[PDB]
């Protein structure tokens, strides 16, 4: 079984501030970390580091960030398509880390947007029934839906993590096999009729909803000095643990994702904070 | 007569978002513009366009924004020091919202905060009595004072524009020959004993004070398209005018500066908005 991930790849830049500015206000911040990231990239890489045959379809620009990104992906057991880049700035993210509550992130999409659907599906031409298409919320409702529709014509399994959230993603669920959502997204998009529903609540554990049954997997306690990437780690490892053992997302899968995620939040950065290929294998056994 | 401008250099990035995200949110944004900023670089840059031998002593780090700054400066007749760079520098995120009125702003320094003496001072080894030391508000009190004393220690004319304003800058007046200040800075800070005092009031004109004389110079009425850099355009052209005619800042120096600032404010941005060398030569004549 091969996992195709259609998303984005970025360079996350984290800013430490007192609290997020109110329009009109000017404040001081400190840039504390630069790292490779992106919803699509994070999940694909972690998946591949778990041993799952994985392919990432995302656009990089003819940026110095572009060379940086492509160079890093080269050290991962993941295939990144296309080989070439685009003359656009590579997508980037501004992660506002305030003294108070949880982070706020702003991500550009110039590169991902240029990467048309026509240039995209050809990279999935070698897909077979049973293969998986994993998407996040980096695309428009139309591009996002087109991709899932395509996946269903090729007999693939569909996984959806609607982050960032798009109000219109709400009438997309009938096309999904596995939905992974926040409490915010769970309410704002209202998942329904999905074989497997997973609602993540960060440090407050996670829910697995299947066939009417509800199971709660409490989170593994951890020192959270950097929260970026926890959700992506939790999802990639939950999915990996099911795929390896050959079952459907189950309680042990969440048990593993919770452990993988605790390692991630205990480290600075994005790509640089993810559990190593060996730590994951030790974890998954 | 040469001008040494001890200050900062920045990259100001304008991001367009639908609205400022709340703490836990994750939104899409568009990185629309990027300009070189910093009252230090702005002032030094405009002075050099006026034909004044100018040296900007500011620090840039080892990141994308650093290489870009180093690259954009090559286009100005300005000389930037030191050569080479340091690590992760000053720049600001200008969050331009939608419906939601005014822009929120986050700024970082770090490059300036760490640009120690010993690092700056040797760059004025060629300075002589008569040369000018222009300094803004981007540096601690001890660092700023130390610079003015070194200057006052070689016959250099000291020019001060305490912005960002620090309340303790209140003790430096004896070391300053020319003070350029706005309303709020004039009150609180309360400059005294300065041989030349300029109080900026933007559209409301400017005052030239000391040696008894109180001279007011009305502004060029019109209305800002983009107020950015009006102040440092005013300070720089004023200095240049007096410098070119070999006198202390006078009435004519203020009218030229007022004419220049009108130009800057009618165009968007900084480097591409300020008056060009030929435009400066024309109004300065």
In short:
2 copies of one chain form a homodimer. The first copy, chain A, has 9 helices and 14 strands. The first copy, chain A, has 285 residues and is α/β, with parallel strands linked by helices.
Write a concise keyword list for the protein shown above.
UDP-N-acetylmuramoyl-L-alanine:D-glutamate ligase, globular, alpha/beta, 31% helix, homodimer, four-stranded mixed beta sheet, nine-stranded mixed beta sheet, metal-binding (chains A, B), cytoplasm (chains A, B), metal ion binding (chains A, B), 285 residues, 9 helices
Q: What does this entry look like structurally?
A:
The structure is a homodimer of 285-residue chains. The first copy, chain A, has 285 residues and is an alpha/beta fold. The first copy, chain A, has a single domain, classed as Ribokinase (UDP-N-acetylmuramoyl-L-alanine:D-glutamate ligase), CATH 3.40.1190.20. The first copy, chain A, has helices spanning 39-49, 64-73, 110-114, 117-120, 141-153, 183-189, 230-244, 251-265, 277-284; strands at residues 2-6, 10-17, 26-28, 30-37, 53-57, 79-81, 93-98, 104-107, 132-135, 157-160, 178-181, 196-200, 206-210, 213-217. In chain A, strands 6-5-1-9-10-11-12-13-14 form a 9-stranded mixed beta sheet, sandwiched between helices. Chains A and B meet through strand 3, strand 4, strand 7 and strand 8 of A and strand 3 and strand 8 of B. Strand 8 of chain A pairs parallel with strand 3 of chain B. Chains A, B: ATP binds at residues 182, 200-205, 231-232. Chains A, B: One of its GO terms (molecular function) is metal ion binding. Chains A, B: Its cofactor is Mg(2+). Chains A, B: It comes from Klebsiella pneumoniae subsp. pneumoniae (strain ATCC 700721 / MGH 78578).
